[PDB]
Design a protein around this ligand. Structure first.
Ligand SMILES: Nc1ccn([C@@H]2O[C@H](COP(=O)(O)OP(=O)(O)OC[C@@H](O)CO)[C@@H](O)[C@H]2O)c(=O)n1
Ligand SMILES: Nc1ccn([C@@H]2O[C@H](COP(=O)(O)OP(=O)(O)OC[C@@H](O)CO)[C@@H](O)[C@H]2O)c(=O)n1
Lengths: 126, 126
């Protein structure tokens, strides 16, 4: 089995998030998503409108997602790969190159973001 | 096969919608979701931040959802229920009593809304 993993906040779920999860799942045959806690989201200079409990609730229902775990800190990644027998690590390309240190453990893939949509555009126009 | 159908806009999909779809599917073996077109939304004196195309895309990925069709007008219910062989019509109880005219065709049920969350709240708080 080819196991894939991706990390993120996924607040105010939109079609750009959907498209990221879609391609990620299709890079293998099982997808794990580590969703950022509200404490960690803050370490990213961000504040989620939806709570961790509710953000995880919604994401667990999306077909592409097989299971959800919490993202608590930056250092947990290498162990996550070992614990979940991960074969592919994926993120949107705004993280291009930031996680190349995991290449010696698994395949690393950066997916081009979906142009035209973001959580900032949503709040701003709303 | 016990078929269920439900109608709605589902803009800015949140946890309240998810719990409605979860309990809707719990009622039968298959769930059809008829999503309000941007044109029909106007007839309900509303305007969705997310277009139909995008609201349908995300919705289609929810595991509880087997099939999606457009809700174009108020009158299509009778014909829809016949076309899709629906056995159970369900809506959140903020619509209680409003669709009882369908009882001569199928089983009508109302589920208690999820208090504390709504599309308007998200917009006003943002
Ligand atoms: N239009 C968009 C918006 C987002 N994304 C992707 O959505 C995923 C995560 O969305 P975020 O909520 O912004 O999570 P993020 O802050 O990028 O996670 C950062 C950290 O958890 C990494 O360890 C990312 O892979 C991002 O590239 C995308 O492809 N297209
Ligand atoms: N906290 C909430 C919010 C919404 N809902 C349910 O979500 C479904 C639809 O959400 P809406 O986007 O508000 O669509 P609506 O305008 O209610 O549909 C109207 C019309 O199409 C019916 O013929 C409804 O069954 C509603 O009761 C809920 O149970 N709990």
């Amino acid at each position: 089995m080819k196991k894939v993993i991706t990390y993120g906040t996924f607040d105010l779920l939109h079609w750009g998030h959907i498209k990221l999860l879609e391609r990620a799942k299709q890079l293998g045959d099982y997808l794990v998503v580590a969703i950022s806690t509200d404490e960690f989201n803050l370490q990213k200079q961000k504040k989620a409108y939806h709570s961790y409990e509710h953000r995880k609730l919604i994401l667990e229902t999306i077909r592409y997602v097989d299971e959800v775990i919490p993202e608590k800190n930056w250092e947990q990644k290498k162990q996550d790969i070992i614990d979940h027998n991960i074969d592919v690590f994926v993120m949107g390309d705004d993280w291009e190159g930031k996680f190349d240190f995991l290449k010696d453990q698994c395949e690393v893939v950066y997916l081009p973001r979906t142009e035209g949509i973001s959580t900032t555009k949503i709040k701003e126009e709303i």
